[PDB]
Design a protein around this nucleic acid. Sequence first.
RNA 1: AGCCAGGAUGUUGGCUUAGAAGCAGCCAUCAUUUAAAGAAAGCGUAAUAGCUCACUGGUCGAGUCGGCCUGCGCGGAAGA
Lengths: 176, 141, 38, 132, 163
Amino acid sequence: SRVAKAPVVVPAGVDVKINGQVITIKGKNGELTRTLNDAVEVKHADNTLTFGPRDGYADGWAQAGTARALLNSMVIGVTEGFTKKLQLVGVGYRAAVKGNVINLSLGFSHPVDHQLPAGITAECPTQTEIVLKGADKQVIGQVAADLRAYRRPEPYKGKGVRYADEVVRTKEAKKK
Amino acid sequence: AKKVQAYVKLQVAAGMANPSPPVGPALGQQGVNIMEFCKAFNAKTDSIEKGLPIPVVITVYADRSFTFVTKTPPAAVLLKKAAGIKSGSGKPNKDKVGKISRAQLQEIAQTKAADMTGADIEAMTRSIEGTARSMGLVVED
Amino acid sequence: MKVRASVKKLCRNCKIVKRDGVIRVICSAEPKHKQRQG
Amino acid sequence: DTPILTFMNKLDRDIRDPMELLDEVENELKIGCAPITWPIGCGKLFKGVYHLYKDETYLYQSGKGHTIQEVRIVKGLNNPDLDAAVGEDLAQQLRDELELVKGASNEFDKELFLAGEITPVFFGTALGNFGV
Amino acid sequence: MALNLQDKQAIVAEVSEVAKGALSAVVADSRGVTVDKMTELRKAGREAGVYMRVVRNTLLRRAVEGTPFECLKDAFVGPTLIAYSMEHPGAAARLFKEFAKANAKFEVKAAAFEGELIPASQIDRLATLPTYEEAIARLMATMKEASAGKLVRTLAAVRDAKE
RNA sequence: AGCCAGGAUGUUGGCUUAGAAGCAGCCAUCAUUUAAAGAAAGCGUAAUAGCUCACUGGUCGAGUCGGCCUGCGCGGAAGA
Ligand SMILES: [Mg+2]
Ligand SMILES: [Mg+2]
Ligand SMILES: [Mg+2]
Ligand SMILES: [Mg+2]
Ligand SMILES: [Mg+2]
Ligand SMILES: [Mg+2]
Ligand SMILES: [Mg+2]
Ligand SMILES: [Mg+2]
Ligand SMILES: [Mg+2]
Ligand SMILES: [Mg+2]
Ligand SMILES: [Mg+2]
């Protein structure tokens, strides 16, 4: 329903290789990408992808909409690519990158060296910003999470790895 | 006009300009000199008369002092010199304390010729009407 | 978080979700509104 | 008209930008700043100080504050051993800051120091016994 | 609010402001501030007043289905967001310039001034109307005829002829 | 429902007010500026606050809202 009942428009360029229950999309950039579905039946035809339920499944629609959105983000995936961005806060922090493994300094007694996964690269335009583009939305989102994790933002001064979409409450300490 | 940059308003009466005990280190602490608040004020304050409360903007940049463009006074304090009691509310609506009329407060609404959101010289009448009813004053229009 | 047997949203930013077999309140403004066992 | 040496203590601690520290000293104390040494990293990342006039880098060792540590120098400001000993990342920030420093500071002049018009600024840590 | 009745109402009134109207300006208002009202209503203190309104009624379906008061070529004048400006008393002059110099100060887009009724058509801000009660522009317009256009050509040789 | 906007002026209301200029406080809640804007929702201020909410316009384009009568399930639920 709705998101499901919506189109998808396969932008002139993406391969769209529907093999039964396996869809594989490649284009511009991005190492292909190929997920699976279930109670949803997908149909190519024309310049789009249609997503609908399938009698016998009450999951229908709900499984179909997530199909849409997923598939949707897969097109765009290899098309525009995918965003990122985290900034470090607090004296003595800062990140590195030196290949495909980011080196982090976060006030521990040791560096951290986090190693990027497959289809996702990142640069440090600044000592204190990590920007990581990739095709797989589900994965950038992770590596972001995973990075920010080494030092989530403490709610007193704000030190730690934020996103930018951050909100950091920050509050005063108990009175004396 | 723009928006926000620097401005406040914390005084008591023009009768005693630039006070120390009432406000002091509270009359301005951001770019305002406590002693320099008796030069540009009385340059026009003592120029008309002292007594009525006079708040004003505090346009502050980074050029030493500050610049305040003054305008009109509170139409609520005009009930201690030009209406009745030295106070105001005290005992609000538990008894018909004070009472003004249509006649009075007329030339009080007339003075604010650059401070009225109502081109209608008649509409800007009921605006101060409430300014003389926020303590329990009946109106004999 | 609170593990009361009645959960109840409190603020207006308090959500109420079921993750796993368990009802929870998720408040975005206040974390004191975070709840399980509902 | 008494002359002032300046020592920036507590580089073991997380501190302010030493650039900004120079502003606060010139602006609020009404006296010129002439950096002699310059910190490389601060807090957990204090690695030592680069001497501007001797052109070499004394390397800080952690916790030898009770005696005098081993004097361990790295000669060039572009010596690829400064990169190795300090990490090439921190090493470039030293190089960057030093660029800005030269365009916004002062050469130490003995006459102006004795006249109380510039201060030789040393960065260090009296606790780590480094910079003293 | 209300239903179909409240609907018609806003229209017949808002559209009688176009029938009985002296003038008409259509201004899209992306990022419309309250300072916005604080302007056309400030330029109403000592230069205008209540003789002007500007109800953002791009309700379209409303302000438009409700111009059987004769407002053709306004289906084209119904795109995107707009803030209808309608005149009742006073000349049609000054009101136009107000927006012309508002939006040009940033003050929100002006919909490229899609133009409106009175003459009845499209887009192209002119200056007919605002030049009125400034007939000293007809004093200066005579250009002294015999004399000013004289001391400019019949008398411009000397200051530029001895080459 | 999102997303784009806006949310003032009499009025810093006077007030048991050390200081109170919407929100520990009192009582009042009236009238304008207009498409909407409450002396009123929130964070929380040395006091201004800064930034955000009811309510109205825009985008989108077919439903959406909460009670009622009923069937079957969830949590609540720790012991040798
Ligand atoms: Mg779990
Ligand atoms: Mg500290
Ligand atoms: Mg409507
Ligand atoms: Mg809506
Ligand atoms: Mg909003
Ligand atoms: Mg206050
Ligand atoms: Mg109060
Ligand atoms: Mg308060
Ligand atoms: Mg209305
Ligand atoms: Mg709403
Ligand atoms: Mg049951």
